[PDB]
Design a protein around this ligand. Structure first.
Ligand SMILES: Nc1cccc(F)c1C(=O)OP(=O)(O)OC[C@H]1O[C@@H](n2cnc3c(N)ncnc32)[C@H](O)[C@@H]1O
Length: 394
């Protein structure tokens, strides 16, 4: 059945009066955001035809997340990238996906070059909701817009760009719901009302799931912060927001050690991704009564696909494949490794798997060969089935 991801999220059975995003000491409800998204969608539909690409070079904010979903609502294909990207990096990405539109921070330069996109800027003053000058460009919004562009659930509806010539990972309605269900429901069992805080930003796939999607998907809420996460800023946000679920990385947990007491006041579920969690970090927080759950995700797989399960986490370990995912280890001749304590390259398939790169040579697309994503990570398995990272392929 033809569907639209934003519409599907809006139909999930959660109280429309509960928080969905927090920003600068303010709170926006699901109903407030839906109302704004549809209004903004009414304007974007005047500017973009179905399928047109859009690059958002913005700091984390409710307007970013909503604008992202408004693009999808009208059938556009958005991508969220570092707002402090070098000018050439932003052009290389916008060229790769042939963007029609780029939305940037206030005072940002215009994009140039062959077929350069239209550049619109956010408003100064960091308002809770931003029209990104759409009011002046296409006029005010419709009042009761609902003209969702519905497409095959397997089709691309947004992109994720992770040193080389940039590549765009396609994500579809189907595999996006796939990686949310596996991680937010089956692994973490997030609850309605759960206050989430992801330190990695939404231009990182990890952060896009944590902050953008999971609030809608599970009825939870996420703190959004448009300033860079220094330990000083992270702690103040911890004290003001008191999240129940923290999404961090190993160095973040290392830097939070001198503030263990403040974190323990609210955080009941601590997650780490991006790189291996050292045993030393796992045990320091265990001594303070905090379990840190290490899991691996990759842009090409949507989110975390192999992780320590809450309440059963172990030091120096990446845990188990999430439900629905299958993991395989291959030796240097492409043969599947069955033994434990024998390292090989990790391949994965499952609900979160991307259908491919937006624009790529056949060699690049070969990373998805055979229905598996080749992580390029060396892994070994132990007798319990749990995986441990062993380096990179060569
Ligand atoms: N997109 C994401 C969504 C959710 C969570 C994420 F981590 C990402 C992400 O890290 O995505 P990414 O930029 O594509 O990097 C993917 C690459 O990071 C490395 N890695 C990620 N977690 C790791 C871990 N816990 N232990 C060891 N190595 C790890 C590895 O080498 C992998 O292949």
């Amino acid at each position: 059945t033809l569907a639209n991801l934003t519409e599907v999220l809006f139909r999930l059975d959660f109280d429309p009066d509960t928080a969905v995003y927090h920003y600068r000491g303010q709170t926006l409800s699901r109903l407030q955001c839906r109302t704004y998204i549809l209004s903004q969608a009414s304007q974007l539909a005047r500017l973009l035809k179905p399928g047109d690409r859009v690059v958002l070079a913005l700091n984390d904010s409710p307007s970013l997340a909503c604008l992202f979903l408004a693009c999808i609502a009208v059938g556009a294909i958005p991508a969220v990238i570092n707002p402090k990207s070098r000018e050439q990096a932003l052009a290389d990405i916008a060229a790769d996906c042939q963007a029609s539109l780029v939305v940037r921070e206030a005072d940002a330069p215009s994009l140039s070059g062959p077929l350069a996109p239209l550049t619109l800027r956010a408003a100064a003053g960091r308002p809770l909701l931003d029209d990104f000058s759409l009011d002046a460009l296409v006029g005010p919004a419709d009042l009761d817009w609902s003209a969702f562009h519905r497409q095959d659930p397997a089709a691309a509806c947004f992109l994720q760009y992770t040193t080389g010539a940039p590549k765009g990972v396609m994500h579809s309605l189907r595999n996006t719901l796939g990686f949310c269900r596996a991680f937010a429901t089956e692994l973490l069992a997030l609850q309605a009302g759960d206050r989430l805080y992801s330190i990695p930003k939404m231009f990182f796939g990890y952060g896009m799931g944590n902050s953008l999607f999971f609030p809608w998907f599970s009825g939870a809420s996420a703190l959004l912060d448009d300033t860079w996460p220094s330990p000083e800023r992270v702690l103040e946000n911890l004290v003001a927001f008191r999240p129940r679920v923290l999404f961090g990385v190993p160095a973040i947990y290392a830097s939070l050690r001198p503030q263990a007491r403040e974190l323990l006041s609210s955080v009941r579920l601590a997650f780490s991704a991006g790189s291996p969690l050292p045993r030393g970090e796992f045990e320091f927080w265990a001594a303070h009564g905090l379990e840190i759950c290490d899991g691996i995700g990759a842009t090409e797989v949507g989110h975390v696909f192999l992780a320590n399960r809450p309440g059963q986490a172990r030091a120096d370990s990446t845990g188990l494949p999430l439900p629905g995912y299958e993991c395989r280890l291959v030796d240097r001749e492409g043969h599947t490794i069955e033994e434990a304590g024998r390292q090989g390259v990790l391949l994965v398939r499952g609900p979160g798997l991307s259908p491919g790169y937006w624009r790529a040579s056949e060699e690049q697309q070969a990373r998805f060969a055979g229905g598996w994503y080749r992580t390029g990570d060396l892994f070994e398995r132990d007798e319990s089935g749990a995986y441990r990272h062993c380096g990179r392929e060569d």
